[PDB]
Amino acid sequence: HSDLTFCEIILMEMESHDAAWPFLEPVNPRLVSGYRRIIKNPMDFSTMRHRLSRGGYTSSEEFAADALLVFDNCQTFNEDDSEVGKAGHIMRRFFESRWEEFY
Ligand SMILES: Cc1[nH]c(-c2csc(N=C(N)N)n2)c2c1C(=O)CCC2
Ligand SMILES: Cc1[nH]c(-c2csc(N=C(N)N)n2)c2c1C(=O)CCC2
Ligand SMILES: [Mg+2]
């Protein structure tokens, strides 16, 4: 239980973060040329919230795998100096920081 209560805290804090704006909803590939071709496993915060709401996370490491996927995808598709890239570096460092001060 205490494994997933920490996930609720960190997801809530990511959802409300100023830099979370790129990651609150699935990328719409109709709007982003090449996204479906390049990103094989899309992930975003609303999909994590939904899976957390169903309890579809066995452990905290599965939750962290999805979170890291959000930022691996971001770094794969976006230049580090792009608007989305810069936001994902902020969010990734935030996640990494909060994660290790729980484990
Ligand atoms: C993870 C991610 N979120 C968004 C996004 C949300 S809202 C918005 N609106 C713009 N850019 N005007 N872009 C993108 C993205 C990518 O990885 C590729 C480019 C677009
Ligand atoms: C060029 C461009 N890409 C996006 C975008 C990518 S991904 C996403 N996420 C959704 N649709 N949930 N929006 C937008 C955009 C605009 O010009 C203004 C509207 C939003
Ligand atoms: Mg480190």
UniProtKB/Swiss-Prot annotation:
Deacetylation by SIRT1 in late S phase enhances pRNA-binding, allowing de novo DNA methylation and heterochromatin formation. Acetylation is high during S phase and declines to background levels in late S phase when the silent copies of rRNA genes are replicated. Expressed at moderate levels in most tissues analyzed, including heart, brain, placenta, lung, skeletal muscle, kidney and pancreas. It is found in: Nucleus, Nucleolus. Residues 1-102 form the Bromo domain. It comes from the Eukaryota. Regulatory subunit of the ATP-dependent NoRC-1 and NoRC-5 ISWI chromatin remodeling complexes, which form ordered nucleosome arrays on chromatin and facilitate access to DNA during DNA-templated processes such as DNA replication, transcription, and repair. Both complexes regulate the spacing of nucleosomes along the chromatin and have the ability to slide mononucleosomes to the center of a DNA template. Directly stimulates the ATPase activity of SMARCA5 in the NoRC-5 ISWI chromatin remodeling complex. Component of the NoRC-1 ISWI chromatin remodeling complex at least composed of SMARCA1 and BAZ2A/TIP5, which regulates the spacing of histone octamers on the DNA template to facilitate access to DNA. Within the NoRC-1 ISWI chromatin remodeling complex interacts with SMARCA1; the interaction is direct. Component of the NoRC-5 ISWI chromatin remodeling complex (also called the NoRC nucleolar-remodeling complex), at least composed of SMARCA5/SNF2H and BAZ2A/TIP5, which regulates the spacing of histone octamers on the DNA template to facilitate access to DNA. The bromo domain and the PHD-type zinc finger recognize and bind histone H4 acetylated on 'Lys-16' (H4K16ac). These 2 domains play a central role in the recruitment of chromatin silencing proteins such as DNMT1, DNMT3B and HDAC1. The MBD (methyl-CpG-binding) domain, also named TAM domain, specifically recognizes and binds a conserved stem-loop structure the association within pRNA. Binding to pRNA induces a conformational change of BAZ2A/TIP5 and is essential for targeting the NoRC complex to the nucleolus. Belongs to the WAL family. This is Bromodomain adjacent to zinc finger domain protein 2A. It comes from Homo sapiens. The chain holds residues 1796 to 1898 of 1905 of the full protein.
